């Protein structure tokens, strides 16, 4: 088919480049890490009376202190989660404590390398690389609240805020202006809603958005439909009184 | 390695097809004919051996009739070779059901397995599939007489009259008309032979260009006794219908 070991004159593999193309087509995932929490928000999107829109969400829990929101292909993010749960569970049994979000990303990225015909270095069992990129957010007692962007290529960077998805070009640009080093959890969540409203071609409801948060008295916690909607209710009125 | 020294024909197509499967059915449509008429006191089976000679034996009249059991047999349309691997393995799949539960396999289970092995050859491995279509002539006490066909794609359908091989089209157009919904063996035999002559070009219909088997209840033979007609019993039935012309 297409080479699995054949590089560009620069030296960037075809398969890596193609990995970058599926990512850009999902719905935005935006994280801001603050000093009291990590906020992860997604656009879930789609509203139909023939659709159960509040039974599907893109914010899935890995552990009692770790979530991930995704953007790109969703089917691919299931294999990534199966590997990640197994690795975290086995480490909690051996040393009784939290696994590091950076550590997790490296363990996963190792199995992202298989695709194609095998090597004599590695047994390549898959056919393509993963076509989803992830924002993995967590807490550890030795670096507090953190936010991480794993690319399926191998690179994983720590960030204080980062957006991924289709609408990331705008989103990131807004994140910087709104970002400061005295930002808190409660402000950050309101701001998320501002960003989400702006870039929508619709009215922001909780059957097209979902919030989530991290506090260290409860771990990774999903901001529920009932609370997320109350936050949406408060937004619409206050915005619509600045006009 | 093998990437640029091989190709991939086991992939899908821009219609949703698989190259080799669609093609496999074509191979079958120019192979020799197999016909299945299910009656309600029997099963009548007819097959045309396309081209026969006095240099071939015509004496072997198991050439496309194989018993897989004393209760299930198939009629083959396609290659002997392709046929051989699924027969031998089907007979083995039988013995396993028989050992485990002390009772013979229903027809339906055995078909579903067969089809899964055939799907398997295009589904993984890169391999090629078989190029032979089977007509299942079979029994249950849940379903009476049973008549199936299964294909290299692995789809399988229930019948009470079916054909695969060449001239499929001609046999089935006469058959649907002249069918009687519940009928005896002897009536079936008259109907079959009548259909058969007029699907075989010019004067050619002979006993020794035919393979015939009927599966009757009997009362000097046991319940579901398969009689695979050897030349001489074909000669008789042709003269009785008078259809030898």
């Amino acid at each position: 088919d297409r080479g699995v070991s054949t590089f560009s004159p620069e030296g960037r593999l075809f398969q890596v480049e193609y990995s970058l193309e599926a990512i850009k087509l999902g719905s935005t995932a935006i994280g801001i890490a603050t000093k009291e929490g990590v906020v992860l928000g997604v656009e879930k999107r789609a509203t139909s009376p023939l659709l159960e829109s509040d039974s599907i969400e893109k914010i899935v829990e890995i552990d009692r202190h770790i979530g991930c929101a995704m953007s790109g292909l969703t089917a691919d993010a299931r294999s990534m989660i199966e590997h990640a749960r197994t690795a975290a569970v086995t480490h909690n049994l051996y040393y009784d404590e939290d696994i590091n979000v950076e550590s997790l990303t490296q363990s996963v990225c190792d199995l992202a390398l298989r695709f194609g015909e095998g090597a004599s270095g590695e047994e390549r069992l898959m056919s393509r690389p993963f076509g989803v990129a992830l924002l993995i957010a967590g807490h550890d007692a030795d670096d507090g609240y953190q936010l991480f962007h794993a690319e399926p290529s191998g690179t994983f960077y720590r960030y204080n805020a980062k957006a991924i998805g289709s609408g990331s070009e705008g989103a990131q640009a807004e994140l910087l202006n709104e970002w400061h080093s005295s930002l808190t959890l409660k402000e950050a969540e309101l701001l998320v809603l501002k960003i989400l409203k702006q870039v929508m071609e619709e009215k922001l409801d909780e059957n097209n958005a979902q919030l989530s948060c991290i506090t260290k008295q409860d771990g990774f916690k999903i901001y529920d439909n009932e609370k997320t909607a109350e936050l949406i209710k408060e937004l619409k009125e206050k915005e619509a009184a600045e006009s | 390695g093998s990437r640029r020294y091989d190709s991939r024909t086991t992939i899908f197509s821009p219609e949703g097809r698989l190259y080799q499967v669609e093609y496999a059915l074509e191979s079958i449509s120019h192979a020799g004919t197999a016909i299945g008429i299910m009656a309600s006191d029997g099963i009548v089976l007819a097959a045309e051996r396309k081209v026969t000679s006095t240099l071939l034996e015509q004496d072997t009249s198991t050439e496309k009739l194989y018993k897989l059991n004393d209760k299930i047999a198939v009629a083959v349309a396609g290659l002997t070779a392709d046929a051989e691997i699924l027969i031998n393995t089907a007979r083995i799949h039988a013995q396993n059901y028989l050992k485990t539960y002390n009772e013979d396999i229903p027809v339906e289970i055995l078909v579903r397995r067969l089809s899964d092995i055939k799907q398997g050859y295009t589904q993984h491995g890169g391999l090629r599939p078989f190029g032979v279509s089977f007509i299942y002539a079979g029994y249950d006490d849940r379903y009476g007489y049973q008549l199936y066909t299964s294909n290299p794609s692995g789809n399988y359908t229930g019948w009470k009259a079916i054909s695969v091989g060449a001239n499929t089209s001609a046999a089935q157009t006469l058959l649907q008309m002249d069918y009687k919904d519940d009928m005896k063996v002897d009536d079936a035999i008259e109907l079959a032979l009548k259909t058969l002559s007029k699907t075989t070009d010019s004067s050619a219909l002979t006993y020794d260009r035919l393979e015939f088997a009927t599966i009757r209840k009997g009362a000097n033979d046991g319940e579901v006794y398969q009689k695979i007609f050897k030349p001489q019993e074909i000669k008789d039935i042709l003269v009785k219908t008078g259809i030898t012309k």
Partner: protein
Amino acid sequence: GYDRALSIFSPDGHIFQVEYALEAVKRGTCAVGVKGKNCVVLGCERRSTLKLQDTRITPSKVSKIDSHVVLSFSGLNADSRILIEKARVEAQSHRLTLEDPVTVEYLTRYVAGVQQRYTQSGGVRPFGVSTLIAGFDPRDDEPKLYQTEPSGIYSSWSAQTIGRNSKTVREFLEKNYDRKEPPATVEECVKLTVRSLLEVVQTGAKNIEITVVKPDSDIVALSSEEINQYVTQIEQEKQEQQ
């Protein structure tokens, strides 16, 4: 070794093989599921054109995955056996190990998971089948309806329709259902299901097979006799709205 590639990227960030899997489903027969708030109805085509089929040993479109759970499909039968078998095993695996009746969400994750594997993993291609999975969770009276694609993705849907003329049947259904007032009685939800599936089968009232699932293993397949009666009625309704 046949663990090497057989599924590759698109430059558009799709996958060629998943786009081609969906086409086989469309050419295919049509399956539909419409929800009340007491039942979940599944309609499945049996459009026997030819009369030489014997139809008690002609394959059905309804499988038990579990005693309170059904799977229906549109797509190649050959591929669908392979998926259907793995899904029955998984219901029994939970039953054995957790000492607990099966929950619908986990099964859906399982059905999704084998198809997802075969796109990702090398020297295998995805199945030629889209499915609908429905049933009821234990000690629960609210309906559950899931859709899975051979991409391996999965969703819940209040109602969904698949195979040939999916557009036509969605579009119709959308005018006859609200989540705020879905049907309470079996008769009228079934009337609606038979009417949508009439409009695409062409002639059919023995060629349409309805199976209505009420809570916890009350699963009953309505018959030809009954269906012919609803079609008569529909021919009376269409000259009361003229």
